[PDB]
Paper text:
GORK is a shaker-like potassium channel in plants that contains ankyrin (ANK) repeats. GORK, also known as guard cell outward rectifying K+ channel, is the only outward-rectifying potassium channel in guard cells. In contrast, GORK activation causes potassium efflux, reducing guard cell turgor and volume and in turn stomatal closure. Each protomer has an N-terminal transmembrane domain (TMD, residues 58–313, containing helices S1–S6), followed by three cytoplasmic domains: the C-linker (residues 314–365), cyclic nucleotide-binding domain homolog (CNBDH) (residues 366–510), and ANK (residues 511–724).
Tetrameric reconstructions of AtGORK were obtained in two conformational states at resolutions of 3.4 Å (AtGORKFL1) and 4.3 Å (AtGORKFL2), allowing de novo modeling of 662 of 820 amino acids (residues 58–720) for each protomer, while the remaining regions were not resolved due to their intrinsic flexibility. The full-length AtGORKFL forms a tetramer with elongated cytoplasmic regulatory domains, with its architecture showing a symmetry reduction from four-fold (C4) to two-fold (C2). Remarkably, ANK repeats from two neighboring protomers form a stable dimer through specific interactions mediated by their protruding loops, creating a buried area of ~1,500 Å2. This dimeric interaction is specific, corroborated by another structure of the full-length of AtGORKFL2, which retains similar dimeric units despite of variation in their tetrameric conformations. Our structural studies reveal that ANK dimerization in full-length AtGORK is directly responsible for reducing its tetrameric symmetry from C4 to C2, maintaining an autoinhibited state. Thus, the current AtGORK structure likely represents an autoinhibited, preactivation state.
Author numbering:
A (entry chain D): 58 to 615
B (entry chain C): 206 to 308
C (entry chain A): 309 to 615
Write the structure that this text describes.
């Protein structure tokens, strides 16, 4: 058998039913009844054979060692440890001792040793340890449930012990025995032995609960000195147990709920607000802001520390994939770039009337207003009433300030409750430099909304100079790649859209460099690309000059 | 408030449990056997309602007060378990009150 | 006593909180409930570490890390650094992590920001392929290092690593490694030599040997080219940052032209003066054999010729 099994699980529920039944039953045989009836002796042997089947299953459990944190199914070690832990104690109880009692003439020693069966309560407590493991139930609530159960069990055991001690006394001195002379009401329990088992069970348990709840009630009191000493111990135990119950109940509710903390802040904040007497919209603005910050803080921290990058990546993918796909700028680029952007995203919520960054400051994050409406303005410290295209849901902003490295050419302000995406400069720049193809795609998108978006058209000069520099460095890159062969790389950059017509700063066209190196394959590839054969360098050198200089007949012939 | 209402309903159900038994064996049930301070009201039905209400309610919140003068006992087996349950629930509820005030 | 509580109590409380939050996010109960559970148990040990590290004035923790982390890295043949002064800094920014079986650390083809050293435990490293079947190039072991070579290469590192046994790994941010490298360029050269030794020594790096050779061939090309371009435009900040990043001003482009040549033909003065402070050479001959003086007098800037 193996722990992760349906039949195993269905086994332990019956095991715990039998366990609680026997746990309660053990006092029933020890007290309120000398010996056992053959009627229940049959149920006794049924329970004992059930415990034998349990111990057989106990032989092979394949439990997981705590140090390893990995399950081990090897039989010998599981036996060596787990059998020592529990089977040895179980074995003594497993033998049914009612037969030994009858064989020994009901010798008191056998009855004393009969208590061993009580040891099985460990299975019950292990069951609640597993109950506690469940996330759904509150930890302190589970603890108080444990205390209530344990208190009830202890009280019942004491009630049974009370009658066992009473019967232990010789039958002649019925008066001196407590149950013999308690005389509750007109009726007198003159003979404890002849009266029904339940009639005595009810009275004994009532005495124990009277002490447990600390209401003395007068009424029954311990008469026997043997009875007297036991009461002392019982009440001493009960006091501390009830004290633990008090402490746990206090601690469960001393932890203020999120709603409780929020309401406390509402109380003191409305008190202050009433001191000023401003009232109106302001009360609403602070209340909304504070509840929103609690909700956002709930989101942020668990991402920050609880969940690792690889793990958070998946939930980020599921939560944000449509959000990022919808954005037009990110459309038209490879999937991996989109995923990389998604898996380093953040979460932001905002209220009306807040500025995230002012005009002229150095931008430090890349933002996307996924939800809500936002107003972008060129209002600045010097000047006012300057506004530009309002940003709608699923629109990116701040990309120009980062790509073009311009420090906030305008002031960006939110105008109602909005959902915003935050992402840093460093990671974004690294992703861009890794994936230039996606970078050009996005920049071509930027060209696309040019002369269609007022904000982009206003800043379009920076994008123009940026694409000029990008094309220059791309020409240098393709020249370098052509230098060290890289026929496949050159083909790939042709598929990437790189223009072979563009030249480097020296005027060294790709054909110029192919002739200088002498790679006829590169020369013919550029020829069939369509670039004009006659070209000039900084000094005006035609590719024929370098073709003759290098000395290969192939390039000269082409 | 919920605690007080629970006490009142406990007193009412307790008097009903006393009424459960027939007129015979009046001594066996708790009422009619007290004989506190020479009143000895054996025939509870004859007694006016208000005093009976007072006596039952007194016992209910005396058990509730975790004090227990012991004038009144749950002598009969029938209601005997009722005080058990009532006091246990009372223990939990009083503990909850202590926790709330401590908070 | 009860109100004071225990770390177990906070453990369960945070369990309840983010489990409720995940349930409000409607995430699949089969997909991540176990993974959160698995990592959650290992976090129990490390919460004490978090509390101490925030509490401590950061020097004593440096000493304790020196006591423990230094031996582990010294054991690792990878990332020795061939000097001990350099390694202790790595220790004082180094962080640690535990794991569970059947757990994937790094996904294939992702920019790596965390550097993992197998101080203890057994790992398996596999490469994605067009078929998609996993091929384990190597089985990693205790006191090894993976992903550092990727940062050296700058490659996307299309590698998946799965734990094979109980393991202790060290998590390092990429930025700290970059900073320590820029502080010690020579130690970067030494680790490059160590890596080129492992390429023969180890199968995974031998698998990546084609990439190592090509990008080393490639990497030099952009470095010489980029500085020359930044000299051509004249943007002094970018070029000086690049030249202090470790670029060699004496390295030449594909045509042999130096950044000094481009600065002179452009005629910018401060770039030329800075390169003079860098000890740049003038006797350098291009394919056409141009010297900085020649194009300096060709373009027509008096300052560069005068200098």
């Amino acid at each position: 058998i193996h722990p992760k099994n349906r039949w195993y699980k269905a086994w332990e529920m019956f095991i715990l039913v039998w366990a609680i039944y026997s746990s309660l039953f053990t006092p029933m045989e020890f007290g309120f009844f000398r010996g056992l009836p053959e009627r229940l002796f049959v149920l006794d042997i049924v329970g004992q054979i059930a415990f034998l089947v349990d111990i057989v299953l106990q032989f092979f459990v394949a439990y997981r060692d705590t140090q390893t944190y990995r399950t081990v199914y090897k039989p010998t070690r599981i036996a060596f440890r787990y059998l020592k832990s529990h089977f040895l104690m179980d074995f003594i109880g497993c033998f049914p001792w009612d037969l030994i009692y009858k064989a020994s003439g009901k010798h008191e020693l056998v009855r004393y040793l009969l208590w061993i069966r009580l040891f099985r309560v460990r299975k019950v407590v292990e069951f609640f340890q597993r109950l506690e493991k469940d996330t759904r139930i509150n930890y302190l609530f589970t603890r108080i449930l444990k205390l209530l159960f344990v208190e009830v069990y202890c009280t019942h055991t004491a009630a049974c012990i009370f009658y066992y001690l009473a019967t232990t006394l010789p039958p002649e001195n019925e008066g001196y025995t407590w149950i013999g002379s308690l005389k509750l009401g007109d009726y007198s329990y003159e003979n404890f032995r002849e009266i029904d088992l339940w009639k005595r069970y009810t009275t004994a348990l009532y005495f124990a609960i009277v002490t447990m709840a600390t209401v003395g009630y007068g009424d029954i009191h311990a008469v026997n000195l043997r009875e007297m000493i036991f009461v002392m111990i019982y009440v001493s135990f009960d006091m501390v147990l009830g004290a633990y119950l008090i402490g746990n109940i206090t601690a469960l509710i001393v932890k203020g709920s999120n709603t409780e903390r929020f309401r406390d802040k509402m109380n003191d904040l409305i008190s202050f607000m009433n001191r000023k007497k401003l009232g109106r919209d302001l009360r609403s603005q602070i209340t909304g802001h504070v509840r929103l910050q609690y909700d956002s803080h709930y989101t942020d921290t668990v991402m920050l520390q609880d969940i690792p990058a690889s793990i958070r990546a998946k939930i980020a993918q599921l939560l944000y994939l449509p959000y990022i796909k919808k954005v037009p700028l990110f459309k038209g680029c490879s999937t991996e770039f989109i995923n990389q952007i998604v898996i380093r995203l953040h979460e932001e919520y905002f209220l009306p009337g807040e500025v995230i960054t002012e005009q002229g400051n150095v931008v430090d994050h890349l933002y996307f207003v996924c939800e809500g409406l936002l107003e972008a303005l060129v209002t600045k410290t010097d000047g006012s009433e300057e506004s530009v295209t309002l940003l709608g849901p699923h629109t990116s902003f701040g990309d120009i300030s980062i790509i073009c490295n311009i420090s906030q050419p305008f002031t960006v302000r939110v105008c109602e409750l909005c959902h915003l995406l935050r992402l840093d400069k460093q990671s974004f720049s690294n992703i861009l430099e890794i994936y230039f193809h996606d970078g050009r795609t996005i920049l071509n998108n930027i060209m696309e909304e040019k002369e269609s978006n007022d904000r982009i058209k206003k800043l379009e000069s920076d994008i123009v100079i940026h694409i000029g520099k990008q094309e220059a460095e791309l020409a240098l890159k393709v020249n370098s790649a052509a230098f060290q062969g890289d026929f496949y790389q050159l083909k790939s950059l042709i598929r990437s859209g790189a223009d072979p017509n563009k030249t480097d700063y020296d005027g060294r066209s790709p054909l110029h460099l192919a002739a200088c190196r002498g790679y006829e394959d590169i020369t013919l590839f550029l020829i069939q690309e369509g670039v004009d054969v006659n070209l000039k360098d900084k000094f005006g050198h035609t590719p024929l000059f370098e073709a003759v200089k290098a000395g290969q007949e192939g390039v000269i012939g082409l």
